[PDB]
Amino acid sequence: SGPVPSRARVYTDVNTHRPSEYWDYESHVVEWGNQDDYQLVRKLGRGKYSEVFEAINITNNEKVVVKILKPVKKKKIKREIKILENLRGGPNIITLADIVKDPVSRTPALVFEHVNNTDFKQLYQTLTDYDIRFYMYEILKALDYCHSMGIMHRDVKPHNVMIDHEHRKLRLIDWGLAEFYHPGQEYNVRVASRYFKGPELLVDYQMYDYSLDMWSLGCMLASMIFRKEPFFHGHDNYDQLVRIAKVLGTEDLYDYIDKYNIELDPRFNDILGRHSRKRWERFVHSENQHLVSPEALDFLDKLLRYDHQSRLTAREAMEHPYFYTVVK
Ligand SMILES: Clc1cc(C[NH2+]CCc2c[nH]cn2)ccc1-c1ccccc1
Numbered sequence: 123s124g125p126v127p128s129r130a131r132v133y134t135d136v137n138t139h140r141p142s143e144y145w146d147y148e149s150h151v152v153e154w155g156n157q158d159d160y161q162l163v164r165k166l167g168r169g170k171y172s173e174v175f176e177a178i179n180i181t182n183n184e185k186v187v188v189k190i191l192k193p194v195k196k197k198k199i200k201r202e203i204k205i206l207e208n209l210r211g212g213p214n215i216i217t218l219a220d221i222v223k224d225p226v227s228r229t230p231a232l233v234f235e236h237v238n239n240t241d242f243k244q245l246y247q248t249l250t251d252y253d254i255r256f257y258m259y260e261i262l263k264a265l266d267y268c269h270s271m272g273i274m275h276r277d278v279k280p281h282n283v284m285i286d287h288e289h290r291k292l293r294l295i296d297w298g299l300a301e302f303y304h305p306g307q308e309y310n311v312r313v314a315s316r317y318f319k320g321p322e323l324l325v326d327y328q329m330y331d332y333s334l335d336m337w338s339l340g341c342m343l344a345s346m347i348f349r350k351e352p353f354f355h356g357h358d359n360y361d362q363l364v365r366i367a368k369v370l371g372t373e374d375l376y377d378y379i380d381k382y383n384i385e386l387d388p389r390f391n392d393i394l395g396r397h398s399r400k401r402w403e404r405f406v407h408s409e410n411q412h413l414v415s416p417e418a419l420d421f422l423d424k425l426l427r428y429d430h431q432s433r434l435t436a437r438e439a440m441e442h443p444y445f446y447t448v449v450k
């Protein structure tokens with residue numbers, strides 16, 4: 123009689139026990155400040171619906187990041203602002219400093235603390251086993267905090283993680299896809315980035331939770347310790363599940379869909395095939411061995427599981443032997 127319901131194993135009712143003012147973003151009143159305070163310096167990147175700039179705040183001569191948003195959907199903008207305000211000051215959460223609109227354009231813009239990001243393609247070959255453990259723990263601080271505040275980031279990936287390596291500072295950014303978690307709620311599965319999409323999204327299982335973020339974090343860990351980017355290289359959303367099945371095996375995939383009475387889309391019929399469960403050790407090679415250890419593999423095995431409920435929570439992950447060498 124349809125799919126089996128599911129709920130988060132942690133922070134299940136945090137939004138339920140809070141007043142609507144906290145989670146009802148649509149009713150949130152946004153106050154837009156004048157944008158004359160900030161002068162744009164240079165473009166940092168372009169999003170599908172946003173443009174990010176490095177900027178100078180004239181009042182204090184301090185660098186800031188300005189995210190100009192193309193207002194395609196008003197509700198989405200309110201959701202990001204509300205979530206940013208709720209999380210403001212949390213560990214490793216990007217800090218929303220201001221919300222402004224340009225006097226003439228009236229286009230929405232978010233102003234953030236500046237983060238001096240070290241090069242994505244240059245950091246990959248210098249990081250040691252310790253650095254990966256250190257930065258993975260910094261991301262877990264952000265995720266445990268946001269999940270505790272009843273929020274799912276829903277877009278965890280390397281692009282959304284800013285690292286100032288010189289100051290060992292990490293920030294989880296772009297909360298545009300983030301959502302409040304309400305037990306029993308059926309969310310839109312068209313979230314995250316293809317390579318980081320949890321099996322729950324790919325099989326159209328809508329009653330997902332914070333555990334989605336842990337799958338995405340598992341994908342990032344696998345790419346880093348094995349030097350294989352992305353780890354699961356799907357060419358489309360259906361092929362993405364096949365790439366996962368080629369590693370995790372098809373037997374555990376059917377156990378997952380049977381546990382939640384998920385109806386597998388017919389598009390999977392000719393592409394899924396049959397795949398044995400691979401051992402994590404088979405991804406170890408001369409180029410990545412210095413980043414791999416039994417602890418790293420045991421930790422990875424506990425994140426990359428079809429069953430979202432069987433994945434470690436951010437707090438359980440922080441207690442893993444893989445992080446015994448890092449300061450808590
Ligand atoms: Cl090595 C690394 C690099 C990045 C890239 N961040 C730049 C994104 C960006 C560029 N421009 C705007 N945003 C993110 C995460 C990691 C990472 C992953 C696993 C474990 C430790 C670290």
Ligand SMILES: Cc1cc(O)cc(C(=O)O)c1
Nearest residue numbers: 174187234237295296297
């Ligand atoms: C500090 C920073 C940089 C960036 O590229 C985007 C954001 C965001 O939150 O989308 C924030």
